[PDB]
Amino acid sequence: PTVQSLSERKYSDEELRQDISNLKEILENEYQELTSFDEYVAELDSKLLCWSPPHVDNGFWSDNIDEFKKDNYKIFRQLIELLQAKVRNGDVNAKQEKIIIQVALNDITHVVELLPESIDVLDKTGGKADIMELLNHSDSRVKYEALKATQAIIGYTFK
Amino acid sequence: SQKNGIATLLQAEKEAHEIVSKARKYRQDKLKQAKTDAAKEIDSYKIQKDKELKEF
Amino acid sequence: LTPNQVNDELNKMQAFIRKEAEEKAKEIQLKADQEYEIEKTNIVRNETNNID
Amino acid sequence: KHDIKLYEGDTDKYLDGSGELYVPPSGSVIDDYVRNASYLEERLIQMEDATDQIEVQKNDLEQYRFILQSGDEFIAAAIGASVNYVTGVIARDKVATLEQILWRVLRGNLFFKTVEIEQNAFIVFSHGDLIIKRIRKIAESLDANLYDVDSSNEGRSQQLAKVNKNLSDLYTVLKTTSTTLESELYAIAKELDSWFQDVTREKAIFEILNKSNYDTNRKILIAEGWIPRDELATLQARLGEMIARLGI
Amino acid sequence: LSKCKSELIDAFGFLGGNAFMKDKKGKINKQDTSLHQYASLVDTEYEPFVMYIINL
Amino acid sequence: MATALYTANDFILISLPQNAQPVTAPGSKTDSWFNETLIGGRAFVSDFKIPEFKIGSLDTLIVESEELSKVDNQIGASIGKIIEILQGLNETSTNAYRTLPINNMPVPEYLENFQWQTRKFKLDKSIKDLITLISNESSQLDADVRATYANYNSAKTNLAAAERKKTG
Numbered sequence: 001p002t003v004q005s006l007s008e009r010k011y012s013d014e015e016l017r018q019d020i021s022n023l024k025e026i027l028e029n030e031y032q033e034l035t036s037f038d039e040y041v042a043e044l045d046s047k048l049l050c051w052s053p054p055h056v057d058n059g060f061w062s063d064n065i066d067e068f069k070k071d072n073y074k075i076f077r078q079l080i081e082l083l084q085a086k087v088r089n090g091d092v093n094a095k096q097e098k099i100i101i102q103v104a105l106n107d108i109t110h111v112v113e114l115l116p117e118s119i120d121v122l123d124k125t126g127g128k129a130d131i132m133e134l135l136n137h138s139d140s141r142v143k144y145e146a147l148k149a150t151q152a153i154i155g156y157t158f159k
Numbered sequence: 160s161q162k163n164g165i166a167t168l169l170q171a172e173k174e175a176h177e178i179v180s181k182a183r184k185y186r187q188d189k190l191k192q193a194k195t196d197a198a199k200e201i202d203s204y205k206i207q208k209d210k211e212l213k214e215f
Numbered sequence: 216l217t218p219n220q221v222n223d224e225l226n227k228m229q230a231f232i233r234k235e236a237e238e239k240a241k242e243i244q245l246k247a248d249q250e251y252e253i254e255k256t257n258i259v260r261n262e263t264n265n266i267d
Numbered sequence: 268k269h270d271i272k273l274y275e276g277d278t279d280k281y282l283d284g285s286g287e288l289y290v291p292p293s294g295s296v297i298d299d300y301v302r303n304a305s306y307l308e309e310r311l312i313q314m315e316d317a318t319d320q321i322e323v324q325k326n327d328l329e330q331y332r333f334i335l336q337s338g339d340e341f342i343a344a345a346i347g348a349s350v351n352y353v354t355g356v357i358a359r360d361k362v363a364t365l366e367q368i369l370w371r372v373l374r375g376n377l378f379f380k381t382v383e384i385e386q387n388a389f390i391v392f393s394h395g396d397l398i399i400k401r402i403r404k405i406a407e408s409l410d411a412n413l414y415d416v417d418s419s420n421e422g423r424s425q426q427l428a429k430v431n432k433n434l435s436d437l438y439t440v441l442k443t444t445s446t447t448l449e450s451e452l453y454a455i456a457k458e459l460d461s462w463f464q465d466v467t468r469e470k471a472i473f474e475i476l477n478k479s480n481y482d483t484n485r486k487i488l489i490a491e492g493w494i495p496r497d498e499l500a501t502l503q504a505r506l507g508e509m510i511a512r513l514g515i
Numbered sequence: 516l517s518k519c520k521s522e523l524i525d526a527f528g529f530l531g532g533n534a535f536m537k538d539k540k541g542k543i544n545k546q547d548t549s550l551h552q553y554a555s556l557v558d559t560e561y562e563p564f565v566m567y568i569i570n571l
Numbered sequence: 572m573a574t575a576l577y578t579a580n581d582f583i584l585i586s587l588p589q590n591a592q593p594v595t596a597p598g599s600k601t602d603s604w605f606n607e608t609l610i611g612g613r614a615f616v617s618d619f620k621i622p623e624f625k626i627g628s629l630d631t632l633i634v635e636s637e638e639l640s641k642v643d644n645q646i647g648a649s650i651g652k653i654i655e656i657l658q659g660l661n662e663t664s665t666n667a668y669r670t671l672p673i674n675n676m677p678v679p680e681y682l683e684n685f686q687w688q689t690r691k692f693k694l695d696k697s698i699k700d701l702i703t704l705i706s707n708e709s710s711q712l713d714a715d716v717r718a719t720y721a722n723y724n725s726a727k728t729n730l731a732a733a734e735r736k737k738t739g
Binding site for chain 4 (some may be wrong): 630718
């Protein structure tokens, strides 16, 4: 983000410009050019989650939905299970656990908005209720993400 | 008599469906009957063809 | 119109529903009698050929 | 979004009360200000679209909640499908009449007409389960909200219990959105003015330096000078009748 | 023809509906928007009892 | 009308239940009312009861009404064309081609023995196909009279053109 802003407001000397352009390319190239399925599985497993350039893209999800299926979208289901787990165990509004929730909630909106079959999965696992609590749970990014998480679910139940 | 009437109308529709289904039930049965009533003609021809063999 | 008038038409409604269905149901069971005979003759002719 | 009308008032100077405040005495880093606005804006436009979407669903469902309830009573066959009912709102009992005429004359006598008052009129036609397509063409072409079940929450029996719980999910979801919207309106209302003023001066700064060649062939004399930090305030307060005096 | 049709409308129209019988003498014909329509195609007023008029 | 009849009369076809009654002057039998009461007793009432038709379903009934309506206008149209072609030819009478007794037998009288005429239409047949046969017949007739006239109008142009070539 800092580099991208810089690119518009360049400095008179040429060499300065070259450095801005070359650095911009490596950072951006590097994250997207890794496989989408790899990145998603790697974050969920280790339990450490953070937004990233291709981890927030609509495309990332679109490709990865089909792949999830092995026992009715088993991987997605594990994610909903992780969001559920964090809130109940160890409380909420502890630095670590709070980072994961916003990310977990960003991931679940995109998937749900994409496939209508996801609606059953929220209900079976019991994630649908957990989201309603998250509106009430403090911090602006958390209630923001919960509202987006809720609106995607609602749209398929009742049009 | 508004909801008493609707329920009669409702009953009217079930009676109509049952009337239609009854005719469909008839055919279903008639398909099993065709096999039953064909099984009796066949085994009477079978023992006659054996009779004229027992002669030869 | 008035509830009474709307109930005279209600009575007419369930009359229609019943009458077209009896009419349908007679045709439906008449195809079922043509089908019984015909299937019965077809089973028999096939079988006597085997026995032959 | 905020329901605020356009603010201009056209100030770069630091001398005035509003000058000092909506325009910093600090320098101008053009990147920093752009960034401040971009991120908030991304959340806001996403937010507004959501608000609108949520509001329309809640509103539809709230309206038809009562509709299906009334229709169930006019007796336990409107949770099922043993018969067909057409639930619908229409704004005029007058339009209800014209439909009744079309109906009687040309498709025979096959309607049960019941009505309930809404805040609209709740109309009820009831029909066969084989002639449903034909009722829709009539209803649609005079514009009625006559659908077989106006609620889309049909998926258990009683159907009204599902309607009630989506109306329960909707009503709170809506609440939260509104809460997010107000604080954010409050928060960037002040900033929006202060940034507007900032930007005017950025457009000028580029222009002073010359950002395209027409600016060069417009003023051929470009001079340099030093005004200390305090005096800088009074320098923009005056403007000459042709002078564009750079701040920081 | 007109006076005849009126004596019929008044005599028999009651069967069709209490509000649906209006006095008319001469064929009323409407075709303005979807607020006034008269035809067997589409209608929003018609004869309350079944009547066709044949003229050569 | 007063020139589009010369031995016809104008007709209203109505159907009522056999339970219908008049409220113009109560207490009267429907049959008695038509004769005595309806426009000063001048009314000539004739029977027109036609027997049953097979009817397959409730849905199909609706579709029948649609066909009856369009075809009936189409046939009305087709009579409009035929009469227009006779006038065009300069065939006008005081008792024909603008009234024309059906088969040279007065029009009220024809309707009185119209108790479902048979010309290839049968009262034990299915309703739908009969509607189609009647409409097909008329349409073919309509094409025939139109096609023949077209050739008549064209032929007249050749004679006219040719008359100037021989003297003009």
